Amino acid sequence: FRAIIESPEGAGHVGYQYRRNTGSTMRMVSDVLDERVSLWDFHCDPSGNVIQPGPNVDSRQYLQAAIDYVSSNGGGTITIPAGYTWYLGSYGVGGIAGHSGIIQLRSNVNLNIEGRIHLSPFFDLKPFQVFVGFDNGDPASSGNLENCHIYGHGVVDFGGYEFGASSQLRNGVAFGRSYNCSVTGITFQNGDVTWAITLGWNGYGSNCYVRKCRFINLVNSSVNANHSTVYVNCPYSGVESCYFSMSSSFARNIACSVALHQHDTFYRGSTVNGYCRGAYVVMHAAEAAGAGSYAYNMQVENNIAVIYGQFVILGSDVTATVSGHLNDVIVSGNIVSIGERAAFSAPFGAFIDIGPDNSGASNVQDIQRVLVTGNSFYAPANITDSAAITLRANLNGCTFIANNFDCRYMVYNAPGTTSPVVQNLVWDKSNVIGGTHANQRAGQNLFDMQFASVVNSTIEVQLSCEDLSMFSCILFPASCQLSYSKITVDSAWTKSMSNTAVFEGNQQAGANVYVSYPATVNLTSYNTQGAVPFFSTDTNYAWVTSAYSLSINENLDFSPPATYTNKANGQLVGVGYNEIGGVRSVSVRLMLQRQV
Amino acid sequence: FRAIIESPEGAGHVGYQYRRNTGSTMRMVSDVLDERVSLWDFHCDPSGNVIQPGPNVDSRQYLQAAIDYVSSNGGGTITIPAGYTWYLGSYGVGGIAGHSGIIQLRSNVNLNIEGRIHLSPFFDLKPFQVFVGFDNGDPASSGNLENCHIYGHGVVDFGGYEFGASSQLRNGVAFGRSYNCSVTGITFQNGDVTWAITLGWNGYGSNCYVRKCRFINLVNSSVNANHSTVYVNCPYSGVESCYFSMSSSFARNIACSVALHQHDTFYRGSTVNGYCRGAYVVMHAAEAAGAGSYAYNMQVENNIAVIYGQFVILGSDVTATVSGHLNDVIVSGNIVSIGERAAFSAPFGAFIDIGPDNSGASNVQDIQRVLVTGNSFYAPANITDSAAITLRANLNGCTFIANNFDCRYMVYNAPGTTSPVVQNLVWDKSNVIGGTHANQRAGQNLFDMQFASVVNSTIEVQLSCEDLSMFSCILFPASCQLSYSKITVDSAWTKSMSNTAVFEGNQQAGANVYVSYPATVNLTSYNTQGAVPFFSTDTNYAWVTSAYSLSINENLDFSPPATYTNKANGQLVGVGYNEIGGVRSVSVRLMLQRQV
Amino acid sequence: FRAIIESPEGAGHVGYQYRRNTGSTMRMVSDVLDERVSLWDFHCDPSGNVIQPGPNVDSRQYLQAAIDYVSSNGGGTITIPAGYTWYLGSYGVGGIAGHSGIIQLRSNVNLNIEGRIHLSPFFDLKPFQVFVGFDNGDPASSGNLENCHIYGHGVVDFGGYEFGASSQLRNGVAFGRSYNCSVTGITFQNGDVTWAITLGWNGYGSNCYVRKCRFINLVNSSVNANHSTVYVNCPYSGVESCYFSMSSSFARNIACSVALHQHDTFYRGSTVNGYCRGAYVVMHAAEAAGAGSYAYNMQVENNIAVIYGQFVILGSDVTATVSGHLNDVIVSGNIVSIGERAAFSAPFGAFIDIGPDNSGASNVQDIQRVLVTGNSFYAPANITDSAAITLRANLNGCTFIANNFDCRYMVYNAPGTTSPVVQNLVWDKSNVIGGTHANQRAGQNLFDMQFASVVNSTIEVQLSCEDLSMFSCILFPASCQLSYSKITVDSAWTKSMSNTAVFEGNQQAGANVYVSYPATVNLTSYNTQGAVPFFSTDTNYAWVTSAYSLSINENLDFSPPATYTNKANGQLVGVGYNEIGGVRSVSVRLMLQRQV
Ligand SMILES: CC(=O)N[C@@H]1[C@@H](O[C@H]2O[C@H](CO)[C@H](O[C@H]3O[C@H](CO[C@@H]4O[C@@H](C)[C@H](O)[C@@H](O)[C@H]4O)[C@@H](O)[C@H](O)[C@H]3O)[C@H](O[C@@H]3O[C@H](CO)[C@@H](O)[C@H](O)[C@H]3NC(C)=O)[C@H]2O)[C@H](O)[C@@H](CO[C@H]2O[C@H](CO)[C@@H](O)[C@H](O)[C@H]2O)O[C@@H]1O
Ligand SMILES: CC(=O)N[C@@H]1[C@@H](O[C@H]2O[C@H](CO)[C@H](O[C@H]3O[C@H](CO[C@@H]4O[C@@H](C)[C@H](O)[C@@H](O)[C@H]4O)[C@@H](O)[C@H](O)[C@H]3O)[C@H](O[C@@H]3O[C@H](CO)[C@@H](O)[C@H](O)[C@H]3NC(C)=O)[C@H]2O)[C@H](O)[C@@H](CO[C@H]2O[C@H](CO)[C@@H](O)[C@H](O)[C@H]2O)O[C@@H]1O
Ligand SMILES: CC(=O)N[C@@H]1[C@@H](O[C@H]2O[C@H](CO)[C@H](O[C@H]3O[C@H](CO[C@@H]4O[C@@H](C)[C@H](O)[C@@H](O)[C@H]4O)[C@@H](O)[C@H](O)[C@H]3O)[C@H](O[C@@H]3O[C@H](CO)[C@@H](O)[C@H](O)[C@H]3NC(C)=O)[C@H]2O)[C@H](O)[C@@H](CO[C@H]2O[C@H](CO)[C@@H](O)[C@H](O)[C@H]2O)O[C@@H]1O
Ligand code: NA
Ligand code: NA
Ligand code: NA
Ligand code: NA
Ligand code: NA
Ligand code: NA
Ligand code: NA
Ligand code: NA
Ligand code: NA
């Protein structure tokens, strides 16, 4: 009996009944201890003696044994104990080897990480993916991972090691073909990695989430090719209430916080500092196998960001046999700013970017039905390369309502570069244009419409302070066709502007172009006393349907017309009044109108 | 001693002190084991031998015994262990029998559901409510449930069974008269039920929440009368970050995700697919006992939905002695679409519905102070039955600002049906009207104002692309009174429209009606050389306060007036200019204005 | 052996191996029990006998011993057991004595509070801070607190005791110089305290959060000087999904729910009832040591509130050597109302308040780049003291877009009081002005511009119903300079108003002032048959650039001009038409325009 009690079966001979309740099960101590499980239950030598974790101990085989066994019982939760640092020091074997995997995750087996998990220097200058849910080196032949949750107050520490080569990949958690999986509460820190977490595989997966996690200093070298902290590659999945911070210069050029790459995905309530980019919202044709060729129901809401490049990047692209499409997107409630930096020292600053594909093509995209509403954007006055939207690829629709944009440009694309075909671009009058860049805009157009064509578009410009440095409020080059569109410039703060709207190809004359903007016009009257016509000197107003005075009349003896219409020769004409006769000659500020 | 150790009191004789700390309590093993409790502690036969759960074992009495005992100690948390499926196979007894209850919940007794709970076929074709917090068959005589939380990674599975009769009710969790209760993390799946979760009873309760839950395939038959996944029937309560999915055809006609039925309630950050409806926002007079007759502070925000009927349904109604009122509502940040379906194949598609009461009455409602802002809505081009608002019952106010609506109608009600009395309907110019249904609108009015009367309303129509198929942008039948209102149609994309605004009863002439819209007008001048009047042929403009040209003047020898006013006979008149004399006759596009 | 087994080392001699797995560690029962720890492990007398908690037992020394020991092992989580009330009855010692501290928190030592913690009457009429993370009486010489989380379903109860003197301070949790600390799930209730929770110290700290907590009845006496439930005094920190309720009259005058006092902080998704105020958003120069002199990236979103004073209060101030600045703020998606109360019975009601510093100074502030969008506000019709913004101190910018404000005033400041210098105030036309206070506004200006000066501002007034009781829609006193601004009053619902816009100093004549508003004007014509001038009687229109008719013409024999311009003497002039000659005399409603 003494022998049995001191044996490993001893707890199995000591009886227990809950709180001495005579209606409760007559159990043994071992039964109650078996209700939980920790790493300590597997972290032992071949004789069963516990092994203490530390920098000179590789915990990997023990944690895999724990996961393997619990999986064999239908699942449960393994605790990684608090107050210890558990090091990993070798690669895993089998199906995760193809993924440079360390630990293989299994279905229904959760990890409650309370302590620290820390990579040993075996991993310096090597690729690695710490937790992998694929069960095959080829993801197309992998089984699924289901019902796998990682959570707790603990930490995954990537050891600070730099990438050995740019072509290497590194990851924290790759759930794989993942269904009902999640990461909650965990701090990922101190590395040079490609991603911290990836959800799904090429549309396969569902109901995967990252919640209340922290991501700190996960890019550190010039070798790192590219970084996105969370890649969402399955539908009905998202990121909420997370914290992302980088301190490295390289992060300001390469790093993005989130990628939303399948339908019904979201990014909410998070804070970002030190990153190049906020979120990619993309349908890659090459990723369309699991959930279709459309990314729709995409939501970026209520985030706080300090970035160096672009906040939201929209895109879609094609392969030889698949075409990707992006539609039904909402971007709302975000507060974003470009951090302090020299002009042109990072990727062009933007709130929205319509980005060309990975080969630079601008003619592959199918992006439409996007709503950008209720956001703030700010860039410091020196940052020339800052825009509400950089529209660099073909666009089939994007709607802006009730935003506050305070940056160098409202709409921009570089001349000479891409020539996007633009449809259904809507810039409502409720967008407020800030004044930070007033006086900085010599030679520049606030809306610089450097496109192949614009159709079914609305641009309602409203200033809220003067900026007499800008060349124009909106400019269309002669190469940009314009049709079935509405372009207006409100008069407030424009009285002293040389140019307000500029149509280099006289595109405002098109049959279905609706415009209005201020202009200075010289007029001369006939000499008749009484009601008397006034006519413009210049003859470039054949497109004008009506015009009206924006100027006071300093004269007593006459008044020019309050309103005007045109004539076939392109003059403006209206009826004023000569109290006394005489030829009159005046220069008036007019609101020019066409079909509005 | 050997006997005592092997007895159920054995753990009570084995000493323990935490980590060998000499300052810690000298306890016994049983004391430490007593700090937790699981189903295994009650899942035993009359001799105390543990019983293994399975399809042929009814776990119900054991789980009730666990809850009853823990309740007797002031509460705690019972674990339902992972790696096992616990079946329920009989009805509960006592106060929950009136509710077809299975398990009775008790105050301060939480359930950590890590495994699976699964209904046995005893329940096929029968009513049931799995967890019930009432303690009496009559809810009015029930005590309260307080401080009861259900949480974990586990599952409640309803066994797939169909309803036996439409009059039956089925539920997952009915908290009852519930205060500080919640469901977090749980998957509810595989059933034909009326609700998954209900919070509160007729306004009694507070601080009840459903967070991070999943609801999958909970309608499956033509017998199911009606389904709402979560019914919120107490104040200061809500639903956040949940996932709702249905696959059944019947769900597209009957199922709603949430009901917000008391004040200070919310529905946020959730994803919905396959449902008829998103949320009811309602004050039923019949439910007003616990928290008053007003539903106020109602919040529907930041959700993602694919539905087949209506996204938000507003209503209030009366009983013989109580009148319900709905006010102070916000609907914001939602991205919603009607899924692919034939026209008229499901309940009329809508973003907002003002719905008649359960007996079809449209004259009982008191709905006001509602803000609908910053939302997107889309319906495919074939879905005739799609509207930004179906306004089908009396409305005392609703405000639309900065939404993007892309569907067949903006405002609709069916003619010949209800004749709502409308007050304080505000449709701000910042609402963007999409183009998906361009060319589909033969015979139809984009704003079809099929009401008894409209007062204190604003409709500012702005198109963003052409749709020459529509009969009009806005139409008032002669039966609809219109007063103290503002109705405008912006000219952009309207030059080729036959009709823009239509007032079948000439209602735009009312003393306090403020309007503007485009119209084509034929004019003829006098023959005088010089300043010369032009007059409309037609005499239906006695209501016009001013008009101005929307057309160019192709003539050299004359120009028509830029602006016009009227005369008592209903002609328009203005002063143009004949360079050379002659009677002139022109057809001009004008902006007609009344008091604006 | 019997002796060893019954000794406190007995569990250390009973062997265990997990689930009889021969690959698992050969452990002892004590090893597995040592994986968790509770208060019971320290709640014992000097002989090691457990002590039962209760009203006559002071648990403080035992809980401190638990925290101290766990800290010595690198941390972990202590459970405060369910089903017991643990009383605290004495002050702590050492570094927390300076803070009237009870329990000292330590790094990596979490508290899972499942039971109740309750203050004994030793604390009646005394100061106290229940949990303190400082380790020194002087916060400047304190070390940090890191990785400390308090969570669970339990309760902190402040015993109901009133403050003994107004100068006393009371707190629930002061994390101190706190990094990665949080409170989740806890109910704080039944007290008279200054704060429930404070995060950070004068900018020192990071990543501190309060989530899913309840705060109930935490002010109860006239002695309580001031209350803010959560004070956020470190960056990258915030409050989400919490519930705040007060019932005391004194709370309606003194209590605020949240203070956001450092950069990158947030307040989201919460419900508030019974409070004076919703949130302070402030940069105090005196708090700028840890994170700089700027509060930026401040977010108040998606909250529900019933308050008695002001929802959001903006401010910044200076010390002898530091100047505080507030910028980049977003207030969005909130639904707020002033509760039922007499006019002037609580602090002036407001959605936004621009508040003077604690000494009443209005000339110290630097507040700019604020966006207020997509909110609802309501105040009952009797509450004279209700405003969308009380602008009481110097303002460098604030933007309003697409809100719904339903209260007495839109913009207000009291005359004779402060004279703020105002820049970059933007009130977009998409703001909807409700009608609740129609007929209540005798003697009052809806926008009462009681400022020293206004520059670079926009006010676009749009009514949605009539209120002929108001003196004016917008009024500038002669003492208020106005320049480089845009002020418009839409005509809808204004035909019967005596005054629309009022410029007591004729400020609308300034060179860069852009205005438009309705006015009644008397005109007289010359007697000439045919085209004939009409001139205003009055000569106060030298500022007018154009005007147009808002009235119909009831005459057959003539028509007045549709449009007008001015003359140097300040008359208006335009060209009408006399079919028959005669001097005409008419009174017309005109839209007066200046540079628009
Ligand atoms: C870091 C990042 O995510 N960057 C975005 C771009 O992603 C693209 O480049 C990445 C570079 O790291 C990835 O490619 C790399 O990894 C591939 C996947 O690894 C293989 O498969 C894994 C399952 C195994 O575990 C690995 O062992 C390995 O076998 C690899 O095939 C590539 O060769 C390599 O360079 C990224 O790849 C995706 O990764 C996710 C996450 O792991 C995975 O779920 C997907 O299966 C995988 N996709 C593909 C197609 O392989 C790859 O997509 C991203 O393209 C870009 C988007 O913006 C651009 O394109 C837009 C749309 O046209 C346009 O609007 C915009 O302007 C463009 O800039 O954004 C980041 O740069
Ligand atoms: C499924 C659903 O919720 N549908 C909404 C309508 O709800 C109404 O019908 C339901 C049909 O299932 C419920 O009625 C049924 O259940 C009743 C309650 O069961 C009793 O009481 C429970 C406490 C016991 O546990 C049970 O054992 C039983 O005794 C029953 O009395 C009815 O006879 C039965 O048909 C639903 O009832 C409510 O249920 C909640 C949740 O359990 C409960 O808290 C309430 O006490 C109970 N209320 C009442 C009054 O009994 C009942 O409300 C809903 O009416 C509709 C709203 O839209 C319509 O009305 C709007 C306002 O006028 C109008 O704008 C809109 O256009 C209309 O369509 O929405 C769903 O259909
Ligand atoms: C209750 C509250 O928070 N009210 C807001 C005002 O806060 C200011 O008054 C408070 C009154 O309770 C605090 O001052 C009191 O407490 C001080 C701190 O206690 C000391 O330090 C602690 C660390 C120790 O633990 C204590 O033992 C003690 O030694 C004390 O020095 C003061 O003497 C005392 O009256 C509040 O103080 C802050 O408290 C936080 C939280 O604990 C702490 O982190 C900070 O270090 C501490 N700050 C300072 C400067 O001491 C003090 O700030 C608040 O000022 C007001 C803001 O609105 C006004 O000002 C705006 C900007 O100009 C203006 O826009 C607006 O119109 C104004 O009304 O809001 C609440 O009233
Ligand atoms: Na690979
Ligand atoms: Na859109
Ligand atoms: Na072109
Ligand atoms: Na019943
Ligand atoms: Na409203
Ligand atoms: Na009628
Ligand atoms: Na102190
Ligand atoms: Na702003
Ligand atoms: Na002044």
CA–CA min distance B304, chain A (Å): 7
> What resolution (Å)?
1.5
Q: What is the amino acid identity at position A198?
A: T
**Token pair recorded at residue C18:** 């997990």
* A453-455, strands of its sheet edge to edge: A421-423, A453-455, A481-483
Q: Please list the helix, strand and coil fractions of chain C in percent, rounded to the nearest 5, in that order.
A: 10, 45, 50
Q: Which residues of B touch C81 (CB under 8 A)?
A: 35
Q: How far apart are CA C331 and CA A164, in angstroms?
A: 46
The residue whose CB lies within 8 Å of the most ligand 1 atoms, and thus the one to mutate among A282, A298, A311, is A282
Phi and psi, residue C408, nearest 5°: -70, -50
Q: Which ligand is nearest to the CA of A309?
A: 1
Tell which residue, B145, B88, B75, has the closest CA to residue B115.
Answer: B88
Mutate to test the interface with B, among C51, C304, C403, C430 (most CBs of B within 10 A): C304
**Token pair recorded at residue C500:** 């629309």
Out of B77, B105, B134, a domain closes at B77
Q: B493 CB near a chain A CB, below 8 Å? A: yes
Q: A83 CB near a chain B CB, below 8 Å? A: no
Q: How far is the CA of C329 from the centre of ligand 3 (A)?
A: 21
Nearest to B110 among C5, C153, C490 (CB): C153
Half-sphere exposure of A324 (CA within 13 A, CB side): 27
Q: How far apart are CA C196 and CA C209, in angstroms?
A: 13
Q: How far apart are CA C1 and CA C10, in angstroms?
A: 9
Q: How far apart are CA B41 and CA A460, in angstroms?
A: 70
Nearest to B546 among C245, C531, C562 (CB): C562
- What residues contact C53, with CB distance under 8 A and at least 6 apart? C43, C59, C84, C85, C86, C87
Say if ligand 3 is within 6 A of residue C202 CB. Answer: yes
- What residues contact C81, with CB distance under 8 A and at least 6 apart? B35, C38, C39, C40, C114, C115
Q: A271 CB near a chain C CB, below 8 Å? A: yes
CA–CA min distance B173, chain C (Å): 19
- What residues contact A264, with CB distance under 8 A and at least 6 apart? A235, A236, A237, A296, A297, B271, B273, B304
Nearest to B430 among A297, A428, A528 (CB): A428
Give burial (CB, 10 Å; 0-12/13-18/19+) of C52.
Answer: exposed
Q: Which ligand is nearest to the CA of C482?
A: 12
Q: How far apart are CA C542 and CA C565, in angstroms?
A: 9
Q: A505 CB near a chain C CB, below 8 Å? A: no
The residue written with tokens 């054949």 in the block is: A542
- What residues contact C251, with CB distance under 8 A and at least 6 apart? C219, C227, C274, C275, C276
- Would you say how long chain C is, in residues? 596
The residue written with tokens 């020194």 in the block is: C136
Residue C500 vs residues C37, C406, C474, C491, C512: alpha-carbon distances, Å: 72, 19, 7, 9, 21
Q: How far apart are CA C247 and CA C226, in angstroms?
A: 16
Cα C419 to chain centroid, rounded:
23
CATH number of the structural domain spanning residue C216 = 2.160.20.10
Phi and psi, residue B117, nearest 5°: -115, 125
Taking phi over 0 as left and psi of -120 to 50 as alpha, with beta for the rest, B285 belongs to: alpha
The reply to whether residue B35 touches residue C33, judged by beta carbons under 8 angstroms, is no
Say if ligand 2 is within 6 A of residue B261 CB. Answer: no
Same domain (yes/no): A209, A260: yes
Q: How far apart are CA A245 and CA A225, in angstroms?
A: 18
Let me know: does C208 contact C178? Beta carbons within 8 Å.
Answer: yes
What does DSSP assign to residue B435? S
Tell which residue, B326, B315, B277, has the closest CA to residue B391.
Answer: B315
- Would you say how long chain A is, in residues? 596
**Token pair recorded at residue A198:** 């990836």
Q: How far apart are CA C184 and CA C209, in angstroms?
A: 8
Same domain (yes/no): A286, A429: yes
| Binding-site annotation, residues of A for Ca(2+) | 98
Q: How far apart are CA B571 and CA C101, in angstroms?
A: 86
The reply to whether residue A514 touches residue B493, judged by beta carbons under 8 angstroms, is yes
Q: How far apart are CA B419 and CA B471, in angstroms?
A: 22
The reply to whether residue A596 touches residue B491, judged by beta carbons under 8 angstroms, is yes
- Dump the DSSP string for B528-554: -SEEEEEEESS---TT-SEEEE-S---
Tell which residue, C328, C135, C326, C291, has the closest CA to residue C207.
Answer: C291
Shortest-distance Cα residue to atom 9 of ligand 1: A226
Tell which residue, B394, B385, B326, has the closest CA to residue B356.
Answer: B394
**Token pair recorded at residue C151:** 């969570």
- Dump the DSSP string for C31-82: HHHTT--BGGGT-B-TTS-B----TT---HHHHHHHHHHHHHTT-EEEEE-T
CA–CA min distance B56, chain A (Å): 19
Tell which residue, A265, A386, A262, has the closest CA to residue A324.
Answer: A262
Q: How far apart are CA A470 and CA A502, in angstroms?
A: 12
**Token pair recorded at residue B398:** 């609703």
Same domain (yes/no): B356, B424: yes
Shortest-distance Cα residue to atom 26 of ligand 1: A99
Q: How far is the CA of B539 from the centre of ligand 1 (A)?
A: 69
Query: Collapsing DSSP states into helix, strand and coil, what is residue B470?
Result: strand
The reply to whether residue A402 touches residue B33, judged by beta carbons under 8 angstroms, is no
Q: B568 CB near a chain C CB, below 8 Å? A: yes
Q: Residues 85..144 of A with a Cβ closer than 8 Å to B: which?
A: 108, 110
Query: Collapsing DSSP states into helix, strand and coil, what is residue B249?
Result: coil
Q: How far apart are CA A101 and CA A95, in angstroms?
A: 9
Beta-bridge partners for C216: C189, C245
Same domain (yes/no): B222, B357: yes
- Dump the DSSP string for C67-127: HHHHHHTT-EEEEE-TT-EEEE-S---STTGGGTEEEE--TTEEEEE-SEEEE-GGGTTS-
Cα C8 to chain centroid, rounded:
56
Give burial (CB, 10 Å; 0-12/13-18/19+) of A493.
Answer: buried
Shortest-distance Cα residue to atom 28 of ligand 1: A99
Same domain (yes/no): A166, A301: yes
Shortest-distance Cα residue to atom 44 of ligand 1: A201
Q: Please list the helix, strand and coil fractions of chain A in percent, rounded to the nearest 5, in that order.
A: 10, 45, 50
Q: Residues 141..160 of C with a Cβ closer than 8 Å to B: which?
A: 153
Q: Residues 348..387 of A with a Cβ closer than 8 Å to C: which?
A: 373-374, 376, 378
The angle at the Cα of A242, spanning A236 to A244, to the nearest 5 degrees, equals: 120
Give burial (CB, 10 Å; 0-12/13-18/19+) of B296.
Answer: buried
User: Chains A, C: CB contacts under 8 A, how many?
Assistant: 255
CB crowding C536-567: b at 16 or more within 10 Å, else e: beeeebbbbbbbbbbbbbeeeebbbbbbbbbb
The residue whose CB lies within 8 Å of the most ligand 1 atoms, and thus the one to mutate among A91, A210, A284, A322, is A284
Q: A7 CB near a chain C CB, below 8 Å? A: yes
Say if ligand 1 is within 6 A of residue A140 CB. Answer: no
Counts for chain C of helices (H) and strands (E), in that order = 4, 54
Nearest to C484 among A34, A271, A465 (CB): A465
Same domain (yes/no): A343, A359: yes
Q: Which residues of B touch C36 (CB under 8 A)?
A: 32, 35
Q: Which helix (H) or strand (E) holds C306?
A: strand C304-307
**Token pair recorded at residue C589:** 């409603």
What does DSSP assign to residue A17? -
- Dump the DSSP string for B251-281: HHHHEEEEEE-SSSEEEES-EEEEESEEEEE
Q: How far apart are CA C210 and CA C233, in angstroms?
A: 13
Q: How far apart are CA B192 and CA B221, in angstroms?
A: 7
What does DSSP assign to residue B56? T
Residue A44 vs residues A75, C15, C74, C140: alpha-carbon distances, Å: 21, 15, 22, 46
Nearest to A550 among C330, C531, C595 (CB): C595
Query: Collapsing DSSP states into helix, strand and coil, what is residue B507?
Result: helix
Q: C12 CB near a chain B CB, below 8 Å? A: yes
Counts for chain A of helices (H) and strands (E), in that order = 4, 54
Same domain (yes/no): C502, C547: no
The domain containing residue C48 runs over which residues? 1-77
End-to-end CA distance of chain A: 100
Counts for chain B of helices (H) and strands (E), in that order = 4, 54
Tally of CB atoms within 10 A around C171: 21
- Would you say how long chain B is, in residues? 596
Tell which residue, C306, C279, C177, has the closest CA to residue C233.
Answer: C177
Q: How far apart are CA A49 and CA A47, in angstroms?
A: 6
Out of A457, A480, A510, a domain closes at A510
Q: How far apart are CA B423 and CA C397, in angstroms?
A: 35
Q: How far apart are CA B297 and CA C335, in angstroms?
A: 7
Same domain (yes/no): C491, C368: yes
Contacts of residues A318-323 at CB distance under 8 Å and 24 or more positions apart, as own/partner, are: A318/A285, A318/A364, A319/A285, A319/A286, A322/A285, A322/A286, A322/A288, A322/A293, A323/A285, A323/A293, A323/A366
Out of B28, B50, B77, a domain closes at B77
Q: Which ligand is nearest to the CA of B507?
A: 9
Q: How far apart are CA C234 and CA C179, in angstroms?
A: 9
Same domain (yes/no): A351, A410: yes
For the CA of B195, the nearest atom of ligand 2: 1
Q: How far apart are CA B54 and CA B66, in angstroms?
A: 18
Q: B164 CB near a chain A CB, below 8 Å? A: no
Q: How far apart are CA A513 and CA C368, in angstroms?
A: 38
Let me know: does C368 contact C394? Beta carbons within 8 Å.
Answer: no
Q: What is the amino acid identity at position A404?
A: N
The residue whose CB lies within 8 Å of the most ligand 3 atoms, and thus the one to mutate among C282, C298, C391, C395, is C282
Q: How far apart are CA A234 and CA C434, in angstroms?
A: 44
Same domain (yes/no): B525, B477: no
Tally of CB atoms within 10 A around C137: 14
Q: B518 CB near a chain C CB, below 8 Å? A: no
CB crowding A448-458: b at 16 or more within 10 Å, else e: bbbbeebbbbb
- What residues contact B132, with CB distance under 8 A and at least 6 apart? B92, B96, B99, B101, B102, B103, B104, B105, B174, B176
Let me know: does C214 contact C242? Beta carbons within 8 Å.
Answer: yes
Tell which residue, A281, A420, A285, A295, has the closest CA to residue A363.
Answer: A420
Q: Which residues of A touch B7 (CB under 8 A)?
A: 15
Say if ligand 3 is within 6 A of residue C357 CB. Answer: yes
Same domain (yes/no): A400, A420: yes
Shortest-distance Cα residue to atom 55 of ligand 1: A358
Same domain (yes/no): C131, C71: no
Q: What is the amino acid identity at position C394?
A: N
**Token pair recorded at residue B111:** 């359930």
CATH number of the structural domain spanning residue A532 = 2.40.30.250
Let me know: does A265 contact A238? Beta carbons within 8 Å.
Answer: yes
Tell which residue, B401, B372, B302, B436, has the closest CA to residue A401.
Answer: B401
CATH number of the structural domain spanning residue B62 = 6.10.20.90
Q: What is the amino acid identity at position A83?
A: G
3-state secondary structure C564-592: EEECCCCCEEEEEEECCCCCCEEEEEEEE
Nearest to C29 among B29, B371, B530 (CB): B29
Let me know: does A388 contact A411? Beta carbons within 8 Å.
Answer: yes
Q: C2 CB near a chain B CB, below 8 Å? A: yes
Tell which residue, B527, B532, B535, B533, has the closest CA to residue B581.
Answer: B527
Let me know: does B41 contact A27? Beta carbons within 8 Å.
Answer: yes
Task: Give the number of domains in chain B.
Answer: 3
Q: Which residues of C touch A48 (CB under 8 A)?
A: 17, 24-26
| Strand ranges for B120-270 from DSSP E | 128-132, 145-146, 149-151, 155-157, 170-174, 178-184, 187-189, 197-199, 205-211, 214-216, 227-232, 237-240, 243-245, 255-260, 265-268
Let me know: does B265 contact B232? Beta carbons within 8 Å.
Answer: yes
Say if ligand 2 is within 6 A of residue B226 CB. Answer: yes
Q: What is the amino acid identity at position B94?
A: G
